[PDB]
Amino acid sequence: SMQEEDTFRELRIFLRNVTHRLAIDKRFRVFTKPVDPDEVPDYRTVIKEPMDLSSVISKIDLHKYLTVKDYLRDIDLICSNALEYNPDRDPGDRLIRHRACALRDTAYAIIKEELDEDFEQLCEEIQESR
Ligand SMILES: CCOC(=O)[C@@H](F)[C@@H](O)c1cccnc1
Numbered sequence: 842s843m844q845e846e847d848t849f850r851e852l853r854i855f856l857r858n859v860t861h862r863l864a865i866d867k868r869f870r871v872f873t874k875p876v877d878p879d880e881v882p883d884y885r886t887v888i889k890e891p892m893d894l895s896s897v898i899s900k901i902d903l904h905k906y907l908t909v910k911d912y913l914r915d916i917d918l919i920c921s922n923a924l925e926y927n928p929d930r931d932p933g934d935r936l937i938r939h940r941a942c943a944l945r946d947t948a949y950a951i952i953k954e955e956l957d958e959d960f961e962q963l964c965e966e967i968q969e970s971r
């Protein structure tokens with residue numbers, strides 16, 4: 842229905858706003874674009890599903906996300922990719938792990954404060970009807 846298409850349009854507006862707020866935070870710069878294969882040729886052989894905030898904006902606009910749960914699976918993948926590629930005790934690895942955990946926690950805290958639980962349940966029930 843038109844009303845269901847208006848529901849998904851409101852979901853996309855919400856997700857673009859959360860993603861922009863993460864992308865302007867200086868702590869999260871390393872997560873804003875894909876890894877450059879020139880600078881890091883090893884990356885795409887270790888990490889099997891790369892993800893970054895520019896790719897997330899592209900996916901929102903391609904209508905890939907019909908629920909906040911499916912958006913949060915991609916935020917979780919940005920975080921888990923950084924934890925697995927950078928697992929060592931040295932300061933450069935510990936700094937990116939702390940930033941990855943902060944990106945994940947910040948996204949979940951904005952959604953807890955600003956997403957209505959009944960709006961998410963509506964999106965889940967339209968998705969499940971298709
Ligand atoms: C693509 C939208 O571009 C902007 O407006 C930026 F300010 C910011 O939103 C941003 C940067 C990088 C990745 N995703 C979002």
Ligand SMILES: CCOC(=O)[C@@H](F)[C@@H](O)c1cccnc1
Nearest residue numbers: 874875893895896897899900903
């Ligand atoms: C996931 C679908 O989108 C793509 O594959 C790329 F275009 C995307 O990663 C990208 C990078 C930098 C600037 N704008 C978009």
